[PDB]
Amino acid sequence: AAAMEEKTIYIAGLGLIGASLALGIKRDHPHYKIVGYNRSDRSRDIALERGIVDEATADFKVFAALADVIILAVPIKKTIDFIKILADLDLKEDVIITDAGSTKYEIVRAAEYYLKDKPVQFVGSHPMASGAVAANVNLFENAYYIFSPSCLTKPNTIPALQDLLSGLHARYVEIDAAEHDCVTSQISHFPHIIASSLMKQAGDFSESHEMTKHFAAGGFRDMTRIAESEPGMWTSILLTNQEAVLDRIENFKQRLDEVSNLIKARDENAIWAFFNQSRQIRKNME
Amino acid sequence: AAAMEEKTIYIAGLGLIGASLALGIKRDHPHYKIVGYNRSDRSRDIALERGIVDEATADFKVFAALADVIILAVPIKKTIDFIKILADLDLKEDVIITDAGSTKYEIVRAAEYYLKDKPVQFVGSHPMASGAVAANVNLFENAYYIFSPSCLTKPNTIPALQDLLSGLHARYVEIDAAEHDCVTSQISHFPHIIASSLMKQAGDFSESHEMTKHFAAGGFRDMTRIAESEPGMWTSILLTNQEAVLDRIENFKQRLDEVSNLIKARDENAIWAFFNQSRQIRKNME
Numbered sequence: 001a002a003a004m005e006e007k008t009i010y011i012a013g014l015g016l017i018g019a020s021l022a023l024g025i026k027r028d029h030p031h032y033k034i035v036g037y038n039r040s041d042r043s044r045d046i047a048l049e050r051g052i053v054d055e056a057t058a059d060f061k062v063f064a065a066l067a068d069v070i071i072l073a074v075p076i077k078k079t080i081d082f083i084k085i086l087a088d089l090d091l092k093e094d095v096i097i098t099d100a101g102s103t104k105y106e107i108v109r110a111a112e113y114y115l116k117d118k119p120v121q122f123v124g125s126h127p128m129a130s131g132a133v134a135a136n137v138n139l140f141e142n143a144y145y146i147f148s149p150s151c152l153t154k155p156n157t158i159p160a161l162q163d164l165l166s167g168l169h170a171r172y173v174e175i176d177a178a179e180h181d182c183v184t185s186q187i188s189h190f191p192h193i194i195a196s197s198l199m200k201q202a203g204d205f206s207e208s209h210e211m212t213k214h215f216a217a218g219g220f221r222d223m224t225r226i227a228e229s230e231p232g233m234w235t236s237i238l239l240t241n242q243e244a245v246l247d248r249i250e251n252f253k254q255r256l257d258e259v260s261n262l263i264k265a266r267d268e269n270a271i272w273a274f275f276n277q278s279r280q281i282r283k284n285m286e
Numbered sequence: 287a288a289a290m291e292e293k294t295i296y297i298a299g300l301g302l303i304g305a306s307l308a309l310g311i312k313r314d315h316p317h318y319k320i321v322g323y324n325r326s327d328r329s330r331d332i333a334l335e336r337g338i339v340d341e342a343t344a345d346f347k348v349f350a351a352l353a354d355v356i357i358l359a360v361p362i363k364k365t366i367d368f369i370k371i372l373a374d375l376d377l378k379e380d381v382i383i384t385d386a387g388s389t390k391y392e393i394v395r396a397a398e399y400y401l402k403d404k405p406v407q408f409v410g411s412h413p414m415a416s417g418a419v420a421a422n423v424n425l426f427e428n429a430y431y432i433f434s435p436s437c438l439t440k441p442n443t444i445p446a447l448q449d450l451l452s453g454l455h456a457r458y459v460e461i462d463a464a465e466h467d468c469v470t471s472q473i474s475h476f477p478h479i480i481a482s483s484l485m486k487q488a489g490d491f492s493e494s495h496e497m498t499k500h501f502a503a504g505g506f507r508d509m510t511r512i513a514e515s516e517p518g519m520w521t522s523i524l525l526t527n528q529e530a531v532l533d534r535i536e537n538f539k540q541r542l543d544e545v546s547n548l549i550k551a552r553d554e555n556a557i558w559a560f561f562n563q564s565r566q567i568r569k570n571m572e
């Protein structure tokens with residue numbers, strides 16, 4: 001009777017992520033109704049155009065009570081605002097609510113704080129990959145889709161979303177929200193800080209040393225490519241992952257001081273071991 | 287009469303660089319004789335095999351006196367050892383001697399110190415791109431070939447090498463040796479330090495946080511790719527470019543402290559400006 005399952009999914013935010021999720025849902029559940037919220041007119045019209053969503057609104061509340069599942073695909077701060085607004089609406093009995101934040105822990109806390117006395121389910125989501133024009137059914141193919149449980153996640157919450165989202169072709173993973181934030185700090189957020197700091201360093205140096213622009217090669221290009229990212233999103237990741245990111249920055253300063261001491265001592269064997277060991281590690285992840 | 291020009295070029299070190307240079311020479315000057323030095327037997331035999339060089343030796347002195355041009359393509363410290371040995375040989379009148387070091391300033395100083403009373407010419411070289419098996423006539427195509435003058439560079443030294451090396455299809459550039467070291471510190475050597483420190487950081491973190499290996503994506507891969515490089519060469523670059531590299535490391539620590547202060551203050555507008563400005567700079571080099 002999978003043919004006959006009915007569902008209304010409300011996606012708030014029809015940017016790249018929200019719209020691509022809509023496309024992944026419809027891919028495996030062609031009969032589910034998708035209803036959309038979006039602030040700006042442009043992304044909302046495209047969405048309506050390409051049958052990505054069946055109805056759309058600029059009033060967040062308008063579709064809330066009707067939804068069997070609500071996915072909040074707006075930035076991190078607005079996700080919390082919308083959680084605040086969902087907390088005093090009369091929503092469907094046991095709606096499953098979820099987000100799509102790059103950082104799990106703060107959003108989960110906000111959900112537990114605001115929704116604890118509502119008959120709702122909540123779980124944190126992070127679909128690990130622009131606007132509704134860049135919408136792509138295959139955005140998440142073979143990428144990890146992370147769930148982070150909350151005290152409002154019931155035994156069936158993750159299973160129901162995993163069924164809902166099967167059309168993404170993602171790899172599902174359950175992980176503690178704080179632990180998620182710790183890991184992604186190290187392999188994504190702090191690297192972005194470094195790439196941005198390095199670009200700014202080299203750019204400052206450039207004004208005073210003209211061959212800088214010209215001698216930069218594949219090494220430098222590759223370590224600065226992610227500097228190109230959107231600053232609103234990176235700012236809210238830093239402000240919602242402060243502790244982990246600060247810890248990485250402080251640990252990285254200590255590592256630079258070890259390297260600087262080795263250079264001052266002209267310690268050739270230690271400097272060699274420093275380069276060799278890292279080379280080996282690289283080869284050993286994978 | 288370019289048909290009739292005779293020349294003997296002595297290349298010491300038949301690794302990737304020395305052998306590829308030999309191939310680039312023969313490409314435009316098929317009648318020049320190339321004679322080769324190499325320590326280990328393997329790279330020397332390949333070289334003899336593929337007609338990359340016409341004669342070869344494991345005794346550095348054997349070809350020195352005969353050469354019209356000597357190119358030292360061994361590592362940075364051995365280049366200085368060989369400069370020491372060339373200083374008390376009777377070389378051809380006005381031989382042009384040059385190196386291929388990743389760092390110009392120390393090698394140029396050593397040449398001026400050791401060779402000042404010999405009737406020789408010297409100029410520093412850095413052909414900005416493994417062993418004699420990885421030898422490639424096109425290694426340097428459209429890459430910068432740097433010359434750094436010494437008090438032993440005569441008016442015709444750079445012109446004679448530029449003619450000699452035309453088959454590389456490189457882009458010639460003349461730059462002060464110290465200034466070269468300053469620039470390459472910023473866009474290559476210090477980035478390599480950072481990439482190696484970051485890999486080691488993430489690798490240490492990994493042992494204690496298992497999802498690290500799995501969540502690392504294109505961002506992290508790209509900033510750590512050059513960690514894969516050979517530690518002997520990177521060590522001698524650091525030990526011959528100490529001042530510039532230490533200056534970058536100290537300046538980078540100060541930039542991390544600014545970023546860390548912004549995060550602690552939750553200064554959202556400043557953190558945004560920090561990401562946006564770097565994004566713009568990236569776009570503005572090119």
Ligand SMILES: NC(=O)c1ccc[n+]([C@@H]2O[C@H](COP(=O)([O-])OP(=O)(O)OC[C@H]3O[C@@H](n4cnc5c(N)ncnc54)[C@H](O)[C@@H]3O)[C@@H](O)[C@H]2O)c1
Pocket residue numbers: 013014015016017018038039040043073074075076078100101102103126127128129130131132233
């Ligand atoms: N882009 C990625 O690589 C990625 C990956 C995984 C998760 N995420 C998360 O998803 C969020 C959205 O990402 P996206 O790539 O869809 O960006 P996007 O720019 O394509 O879409 C952003 C959406 O949020 C809405 N919005 C922004 N500010 C708002 C506000 N003040 N009030 C009401 N609506 C507002 C927009 O109109 C738009 O619908 C991110 O901020 C991030 O936490 C992003």
Ligand SMILES: NC(=O)c1ccc[n+]([C@@H]2O[C@H](COP(=O)([O-])OP(=O)(O)OC[C@H]3O[C@@H](n4cnc5c(N)ncnc54)[C@H](O)[C@@H]3O)[C@@H](O)[C@H]2O)c1
Pocket residue numbers: 299300301302303304324325326329359360361362364386387388389412413414415416417418519
């Ligand atoms: N590989 C690059 O990206 C690159 C680019 C430009 C310049 N350089 C410079 O050229 C040098 C050589 O680079 P390569 O890529 O040809 O490396 P390679 O490993 O392919 O060749 C190194 C050569 O040096 C010889 N050698 C090493 N130690 C020696 C010693 N102790 N005594 C006598 N001979 C010794 C080897 O037998 C071999 O011929 C580098 O160390 C660097 O300064 C390298």
